Amino acid sequence: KPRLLLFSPSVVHLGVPLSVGVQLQDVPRGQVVKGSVFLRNPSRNNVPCSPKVDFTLSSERDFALLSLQVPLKDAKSCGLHQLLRGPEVQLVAHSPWLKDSLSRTTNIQGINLLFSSRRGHLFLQTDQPIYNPGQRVRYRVFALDQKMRPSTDTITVMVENSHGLRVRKKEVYMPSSIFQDDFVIPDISEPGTWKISARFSDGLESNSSTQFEVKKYVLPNFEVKITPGKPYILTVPGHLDEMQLDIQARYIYGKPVQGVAYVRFGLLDEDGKKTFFRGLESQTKLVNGQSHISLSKAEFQDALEKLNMGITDLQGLRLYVAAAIIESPGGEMEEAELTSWYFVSSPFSLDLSKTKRHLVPGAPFLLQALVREMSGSPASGIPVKVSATVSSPGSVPEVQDIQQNTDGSGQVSIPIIIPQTISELQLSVSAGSPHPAIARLTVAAPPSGGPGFLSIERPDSRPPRVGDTLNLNLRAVGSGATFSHYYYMILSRGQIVFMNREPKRTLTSVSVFVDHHLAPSFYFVAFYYHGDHPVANSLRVDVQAGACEGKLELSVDGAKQYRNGESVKLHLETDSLALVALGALDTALYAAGSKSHKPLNMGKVFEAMNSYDLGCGPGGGDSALQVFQAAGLAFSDGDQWTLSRKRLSCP
Amino acid sequence: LEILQEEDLIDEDDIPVRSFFPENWLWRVETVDRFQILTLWLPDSLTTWEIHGLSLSKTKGLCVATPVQLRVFREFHLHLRLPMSVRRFEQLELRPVLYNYLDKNLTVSVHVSPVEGLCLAGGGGLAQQVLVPAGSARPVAFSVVPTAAAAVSLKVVARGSFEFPVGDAVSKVLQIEKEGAIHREELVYELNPLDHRGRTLEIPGNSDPNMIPDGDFNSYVRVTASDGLNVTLSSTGRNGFKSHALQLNNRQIRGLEEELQFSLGSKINVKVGGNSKGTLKVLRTYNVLDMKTCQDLQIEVTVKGHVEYTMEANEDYEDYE
Amino acid sequence: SRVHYTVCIWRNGKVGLSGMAIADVTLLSGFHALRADLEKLTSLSDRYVSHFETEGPHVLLYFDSVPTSRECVGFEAVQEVPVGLVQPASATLYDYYNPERRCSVFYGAPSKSRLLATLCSAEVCQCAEGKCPRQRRALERGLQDEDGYRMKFACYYPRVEYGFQVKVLREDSRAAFRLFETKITQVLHFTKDVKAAANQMRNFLVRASCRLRLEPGKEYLIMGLDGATYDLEGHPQYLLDSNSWIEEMPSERLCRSTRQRAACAQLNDFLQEYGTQGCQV
Amino acid sequence: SCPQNVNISGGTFTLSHGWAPGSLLTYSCPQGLYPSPASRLCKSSGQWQTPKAVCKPVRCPAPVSFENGIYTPRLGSYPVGGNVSFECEDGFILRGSPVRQCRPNGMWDGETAVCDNGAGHCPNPGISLGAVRTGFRFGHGDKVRYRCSSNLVLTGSSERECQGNGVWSGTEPICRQPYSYDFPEDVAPALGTSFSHMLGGHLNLYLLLDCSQSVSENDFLIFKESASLMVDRIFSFEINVSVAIITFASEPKVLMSVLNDNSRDMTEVISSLENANYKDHENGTGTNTYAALNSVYLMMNNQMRLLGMETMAWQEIRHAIILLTDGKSNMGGSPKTAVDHIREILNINQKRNDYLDIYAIGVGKLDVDWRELNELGSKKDGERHAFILQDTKALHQVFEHMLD
Ligand SMILES: *[C@@H]1O[C@H](CO)[C@@H](O)[C@H](O)[C@H]1NC(C)=O
Ligand SMILES: *[C@@H]1O[C@H](CO)[C@@H](O)[C@H](O)[C@H]1NC(C)=O
Ligand SMILES: *[C@@H]1O[C@H](CO)[C@@H](O)[C@H](O)[C@H]1NC(C)=O
Ligand SMILES: [Mg+2]
């Protein structure tokens, strides 16, 4: 009857603290326990790999979060570096309570974990996106720990050329967490995309890299952009929407380009092979930097006929538009290419990845969809129709029809009601009209006769902001109220950050304070115990409106209309002493580049936060072990323990 | 018949030349104590500068600021774009373009400052007369046969009339590549250190008849780590005896194919080690005389008529000396 | 006034081409094409170009069919300002589908040359662009020497670093220059070419566009600035341009004529004093 | 006669033979300005011939390029009295004067600004203001080629090679303007340092004096005076030296030789120098610098023969040549040819380069050519050998304080 619970992330990262959750159950009120938890050897040999940390838990305090440290010296000495086959390790909890109470053969309870040397966040940016051969290349890397604080650990950068051969390598100490460096591209180097990689010296797998392009080019004077009238082409048999483009050419310093535009059309497939339309080439004189050309109906039909292609065959193809504008009388040539144009059967796209699977019977099913305009920003105010067909629970199936428009940014939350003893649920989601986007998903049901169920209801479907408190409702379903409390934890960046206990009540609430470090996605895992069988449910919550912990603001005094050689009073504003890194880039580099490389912004940093997340889907599971595995934890209660994850990817 | 203005122009000395054209600037890293003002001096390039920004602080983590677009515009300038490739003794046609964005007709005398190493038209002293209508642009064609064989500074200058005091001057260093074209001589040698016969190998010295004097001889070694080579390349050289040792495997395997610049005149030797199936590719580059108007396209412009020169470019007897 | 252009186009490779091609000819410095001629050109059924656009010194023509043979078409332009300096222009022909498959052609003025004349020999060569040699005639015209005009030209400006009296063996034309192979009668002065001596060959070259004539079998006095061409044989080879003094030597009879005694005698007096004594400065 | 409308704005002018045909008009402007045109010719009674006249301001060269750094303010050509500041990016340590002020002579002050990271085998030679450099690799055995810009003339080394000892071969090039000259105060320490390297054994010193028509009788007198103080000072150091006096013209004349043993006596050399006159050079008034250098070479060969091929007594013999000329070599060929003979016979290499220094002190303001003086003078790192002084007063001034 008494039990000891062991909670820990499925993957342990070397050199950074590990959070271990420990818990009791059904223990006498006056009873207390003693013990220590430590990482043991992968059992190929037997040497402890971490210092022992004590825990003192009782009836009134039956939970505690232990910050178990895993120093690199102990990991190297005990034999993790000498391991064979895969990278596993064992975490066990040692306490005489097991033998004293449960009369177990051993006083050791543990889990199987994967150990990876990846740690810290490494960011690095180069001088320019594109360079000429024989041109000096400058770059710098930033070293940051788990909490993105500046890190002083030594790092080993390297440079790989276009062919992939290493060209440079520097093992550099970190006094200021920034390492500036420069090198010269060989004058005989062929065009290609070079790569600069940076790793922590003791972290083998912590390689963060950036890429820059090398090409024989000269700086352009103006850039040409081709913007389609609509980023989609409707190819439904009933009608085909007109194809129209607005070709613009403007001098980079602002003024429009005067010249002519040479437009060549063609069909481009997914592989990349482009078949040009012989004929229909349009040449126009740019009037106010712009030329508005369009493809007619009969012209396009004849073009398809010449290639012996049908409208119904245009599935997945792309209408390829290329331009080569000649400045007049300047004579300069600049080329623009269009490849985003896609033949589609519906002007909308449905993303159902947010829809939780394996949902509990007896509680509302939260269908969540993202109505994103095809190759565009999320759409707002677009109706969504879903037909829910509850499969036979013993009677005839029933069809439930709910309609709800998109509140904003494509977010639609449709709480369909699921009856008890449901065999399986079939959903058919349709959004937009006419020519809707059809998305179909089917979900099974948990096995009948289970020990119970837990439901997590989130009244506010809008994503929480930074610093905004989030409250969830927990309700046990399908079992008696033998238990007195349930327990919940919050997972961010693959580490257990919070643990608490809430007493069982009626229509209960659990409040979670969304800290900044919990962004951009944290897992909420809650579970209770019906006798000796665990039942759990994990809800994934994403955090939007990501912003820096501090702030950095650049501003230029006055209007942005200067003259060459004049003075600029650039303004920097922040809230603390910061190693501000600056860089002024000529805009023409973006135009000359074959592929436009977006600069470093908060999106990449927040993705770097999410790169350490161990989550597997939007949460939920048939059993407690499945819920914990999807969340990214390892659970062992002495009788049932989840196996170590087969792969980090969790396909 | 056409009216020409002479020496009533700007003095050419007041016109401010533009010479700083950096692709990127402001690469410094600064410590801001919650407030700092930088007095940046804008370069002479006429584009828009997207000033990036990243913050790294010990207490507030990391932040990336929104880039600031910064625009520089002169409203009348001589934009000049040098050709990507300019070989010595090869005729190129410089194309300075005068963009007149004002609201008045402008008459400008365009000329290239005569410099040693450049064979211009008529010695480089003549100034070409062009007129740029308001809100338009005109190109001026200067034909140059560079005999310098080295980088040289040209300074194209545009001089308006004294009635309308405008003008611009641009001074970019024009790197002259040396005579002939570049040739590549790669040499492939499979590297099996297990076989004792492959332990020591020597690459033959280069004796190329068509190699041009001052052939910028650069050697790069491309050695592949695919299977732990300790290839040590030893070589006597005119400059000196230099040997740099390559350890490609480093007791590790992540795309460790290596490349290192190798500075030799003629001779080269190999000392192999380890156990692997690596490949050595010493790459030699040097100038060569070779040729290729397209073989596919061709074009010919023939002109007939009377063209009036400005009495300073007529190459004939003065008849009274 | 009005100058008639003629842009010609054809293709030979036949492989890798896409047919339609873009013509981009740049007119002379002070010329803009007549739009009437071009619109008449494009209004014809077999116009050979589907589109055109010209502004100032630029003319754009879209050739939608480039065949094997030489088909071509011409238009007429007008002059705005006199051409400031004699120089060829550039005309470029682009490929419609692969503009990187291009090649420009240099076309000269109606009578001038295609490329800048340069006296190129060995592995280093000199800028041949400049002015015509004068071929000064004072004794032949009968004008008496004033203030030592030959001596002033030799010693004051342009100072001469080489001076010889040469007998012209032959007249030949190579590339853009007319080569006069000459034999050294005497070496008056030399800064470079320390190996100058009597009865030695020296190549004197002048641009073919000029009318300078050095009759073979006659002696002339040539002075001027050096050249850096080396003749590819070893001896420095001199070029004739501005700052070069060329005078026809006194013969048995033209110096006999009445007004020419003083002139020919004074030139020979310069000969012996300058060759023997020097600049005296 | 010639027209009298030959006035210059802001300055004066002088004439050689009045307004008669063939007279040479000389233009002069105050310091900080350069005459333009420099001189006019009255022609054969025609209008004045020039190779409106205005004293255009002096303008120092502006930095064409500044590798790995910025320079403020940025101008096309800095005027007199202007300042320029040279600070460069992080990781690069500046060398030379960060602040350089354009002196009225058309030259900056202080060493040329350059910052080097030190990765290269040799120190960064840098881009001198007004010049350009080709080749950004500082490896051992590598080379850099310099080219001037606009109308500047290159004085110094047009090609430098990174030698094994970590010092680039040749001197640091300095693009100069044709009108630019040298102040005595600037050039006295340079001469002192070069002669200090020379004195660091027995030394051979040859003094070459100009006595053509272009140099005047008073000008030659000041030349003789400066030579006399020069030989007086070197004998005051109690160092074994032999000095020879050569005064050259259309045909060179030898007033003293190193073969004679009297060259090691102060009274003998001063008596020989004072006996010099202008009459002996009046019959022939050319400037055959090559002939003078050939006479020096003949002295070299005679000392060779009398001393011996491999005798130590000659191996420790150092040679320093001084030329007080107006830089108008107009006969005998290129003077550089004889310098090639001297270097060949002395077996000049990277090690024996200490045994030969050639000083080419130009004097005058009208017909002094920078290329000739630079070509004659020797080229060594950190030292200047080619000089131009506007007046012989400046020549006497620089010599009388030349040593310390
Ligand atoms: C680290 O290196 C591995 C092996 O080359 C590569 O697959 C992986 O993408 C890298 N990780 C990054 C770039 O985050
Ligand atoms: C400029 O030239 C145009 C074209 O000849 C003429 O119509 C116009 O009046 C002129 N002046 C202005 C101020 O635009
Ligand atoms: C390569 O050189 C290292 C230098 O430490 C040496 O220890 C090693 O044995 C060599 N490589 C192999 C594969 O033996
Ligand atoms: Mg003289």
Residue D316 located in a structural domain: yes
Q: State whether residue D285 sits within 8 Å of chain C by CB.
A: yes
Residue C194 sits in the same domain as residue C88: no
CA angle, A75 then A79 then A83, to 5°:
115
Q: CA-CA distance, C228 to A370, in Å (whole number)?
A: 77
Query: Using an 8 Å Cβ cutoff, are D108 and D150 in contact?
Result: no
CA-to-CA distance for D58 and D107, rounded, in angstroms?
10
Ligand 3 atom nearest the C-alpha of B274 is 13
CATH of the domain at C245: 2.40.50.120
Ligand 3 pocket test, pick from B229, B232, B247, B275 with the greatest ligand atom count within 8 Å of Cβ, gives B247
In this structure, the strands spanning A207-214 and A130-131 are parallel
Contacts of D214 (CB under 8 A, 6+ apart): C281, D285, D287, D326, D328, D364, D367
Final residue before a domain boundary, out of C47, C77, C107: C107
In a domain, D76, yes or no: no
Of A180, A184, A565, the CB nearest to D74: A565
CA distance A338 to A109: 61
Whether B189 and B156 map to the same domain: the answer is no
Helix (H, G, I), strand (E, B) or coil at C92: strand
Strand partners for D159: D145
Resolution (angstroms) equals 3.5
Preceding peptide of D3 cis, ω within 30°: no
* Residues annotated in a binding site of D for Mn(2+): 212, 214, 287
Task: Tell the residue number behind the tokens 């350089």, with chain if given.
Answer: D100
Residues with Cβ within 8 Å of D171's Cβ and at least 6 positions away in sequence, in order, are: D156, D157, D379, D380, D381, D382, D383, D384, D385
Phi then psi for residue D184, to 5 deg, are: -60, -40
Cα–ligand 4 centroid distance for B66 (angstroms): 70
* Amino acid identity for residue D123 in this structure: P
Q: Which ligand is nearest to the CA of B248?
A: 3
The packing angle between helices D335-346 and D289-307, to 10°, is 20
Cβ within 8 Å of residue A580, ≥6 positions away: A552, A572, A574, B29, B30, B31, B32, B36, B53, B54, B55, B56
Where does residue A484 rank: exposed (0-12), middle (13-18), buried (19+ CB within 10 A)? exposed
Which of B100, B101, B103, B105 for mutating ligand 2's site (highest number of atoms within 8 Å of CB)?
Answer: B105
Tell me if C189 and D334 make a contact (CB, 8 A cut-off). Answer: no
Q: Residue C281: inside a domain, yes or no?
A: no
Tally of structural domains, chain B: 2
- Cβ-based neighbour number of residue C10 at 10 Å: 16
A29 plus A89 within the same structural domain: yes
- DSSP 8-state code for residue A598: P
| Pair C165, C188: CB distance under 8 Å | yes
Supply the Cα-derived Rg of chain A in whole angstroms.
30
3-state percent breakdown (helix, strand, coil) of chain A, nearest 5: 10, 50, 45
Structure tokens at C275: 């060759």
Q: Are residues A110 and A125 in the same domain?
A: no
- D13 CA to middle of ligand 4, Å? 22
Distances (CA, A) of A205 to A11, A66, A120, A123, B178: 14, 26, 11, 15, 46
Tokens of D23: 């007279």
* Distance from Cα C29 to the centre of ligand 2, integer Å: 20
Domain with residue D18: its CATH number is 2.10.70.10
Instruction: In whole angstroms, give the CA distance from residue B236 to residue A228.
Output: 63
Distance CA A67, CA A498 (A): 11
Residues A335 and A246 in one domain: yes
Burial of residue C239 (CB within 10 Å: 0-12, 13-18, 19+) is: buried
Distance CA D83, CA D73 (A): 8
Are residue C239 and residue C125 in the same domain, yes or no?
yes
C84 and C13 assigned to the same domain: yes
Q: Is position B199 within any domain? A: yes
From C107, C126, C150, the end of a domain falls on C107
CA C160 remoteness from chain centre: 22
CA distance A446 to A385: 26
Does C112 map to a domain?
A: no
Inter-chain CB proximity D334 and C191 less than 8 Å? yes
**Which residue from A156, A207, A211 has its CB within 8 A of the most atoms of ligand 1, so it is best to mutate?**
A207
Q: How many CB atoms within 10 Å of residue D152? A: 23
Structural domain includes residue D330 = yes
Q: Residue B225 maps to which CATH number?
A: 2.60.120.1540
Give the residue from C107, C129, C157 where a domain finishes.
C107
The method of structure determination was cryo-EM
How many distinct structural domains can be found in chain D? 2
Contacts of D267 (CB under 8 A, 6+ apart): none
Instruction: Tell me whether D41 touches chain C (CB under 8 Å).
Output: yes
Cα→Cα distances A587→B42, B49, B50, B51, B82, Å: 14, 6, 6, 10, 19
Helix, strand, or coil (residue D229): helix
Of D72, D76, D150, Cβ closest to residue B16: D76
Q: In terms of Cα–Cα distance, which of A285, A283, A291, A280 is closest to A327?
A: A285
Beta carbon pairs, B and C, within 8 Å = 222
CA of C156 relative to ligand 4 center, distance in Å: 12
Residue D21 lies in a domain: yes
Examine residue A366 and state whether it is found in any structural domain, yes or no: yes
The answer to whether position C36 is within a domain reads yes
- Residue that the structure tokens 């001779």 belong to: B267
Strands A121-126 and B242-245: unpaired
Check if B228 has its Cβ closer than 6 Å to any atom of ligand 3: yes
Q: Which ligand is nearest to the CA of B231?
A: 3
Domain that holds residue C85: 2-107
Query: Which residues lie closer than 8 Å to C88 by C-beta, 6 or more apart?
Result: B93, B143, C106, C107, C108, C109, C112, C113, C114, C115, C116
Spatial contact of D169 and D100, defined as CB atoms under 8 Å apart: no
Is B170 in the same domain as B217?
no
Measured between CA atoms, the residue of chain B closest to residue C143 is: B321
Q: Are residues C56 and C139 in the same domain?
A: no
Which of D51, A548, B297 minimizes the C-alpha distance to C12? Answer: B297
Interacting residues of B93 by C-beta distance below 8 A, sequence separation 6+: B141, B142, B143, B144, C88, C89, C90, C104, C106
* d(C-alpha A213, C-alpha A595), whole Å: 9
> How many interface pairs between A and C have CB atoms less than 8 angstroms apart?
41
Strand A290-295: give its sheet, edge to edge: A222-228, A243-251, A290-295
Task: Kindly report the three-state secondary structure assignment for every residue of D343-365.
Answer: HHHHCCCCCHHHHEEEEEEEECC
Q: H or E stretch including A199?
A: strand A192-200
Both B194 and B269 in one domain: the answer is yes
d(CA C75, CA C82): 20
Residue-range definition of the domain harbouring residue D37: 1-57
Any atom of ligand 2 within 6 Å of the Cβ of B105: yes
Burial of C187 (0-12, 13-18, 19+ CB in 10 A): middle
Name the burial class of residue C232, with classes exposed (0-12), middle (13-18) and buried (19+) by CB atoms within 10 angstroms of its CB: exposed
In a domain? residue D329: yes
* B220 and B244 in a common domain: yes
Looking at residue D263, what DSSP letter applies? Answer: G
Pairing of strands D99-101, D93-95: unpaired
Same domain, D212 and D347: yes
Query: What SS3 class is residue A420?
Result: coil
- Residue B189 within a domain: yes
Q: Is residue D88 domain-resident?
A: no
- Ligand 4 centroid to C279 CA: how many Å? 9
The minimal CB distance from A573 to the residues B35, B54, B58 is found for B35
A256: which residues sit within 8 A by CB, 6+ positions away? A248, A249, A250, A286, A288, A289, A290
Write out the DSSP string of D19-70.
Answer: BSTT-EEEEE--TTEE-SSSEEE--SSSSPB----B-EEPBPPP-S--TTSE
Instruction: Tell me the HSE value of D87 on the side-chain side, using a 13 A CA sphere.
Output: 4
Q: Identify whether the C-beta of residue D142 lies closer than 8 Å to the C-beta of residue B261.
A: no
Does residue A272 lie in a domain region? Answer: yes
Amino acid identity at A346: S
CA–CA dist D205, D246 (Å, integer): 11
Q: Is residue B25 in a domain? A: no
What kind and span of H or E run contains A605? helix A602-610
List of residues 6+ apart from D361 with CB closer than 8 A: D322, D323, D324, D325, D387, D388, D389, D395
CATH code of residue B120: 2.60.40.10
Question: Do A421 and A394 share a domain, yes or no?
Answer: yes
Sheet holding D159-161, edge to edge: D131-134, D143-148, D159-161
Task: Kindly list the residues of chain A whose beta carbon comes within 8 Å of any beta carbon in chain D.
Answer: 180, 184, 565
**Ramachandran angles phi, psi of A297, nearest 5°:** -80, -60
B202 C-beta neighbours (distance < 10 Å), count: 12
D346 φ, ψ to 5°?
A: -75, -5
Helix (H) or strand (E) holding C150: helix C149-155
> Distance (Å, rounded) from C-alpha A322 to C-alpha A309?
21
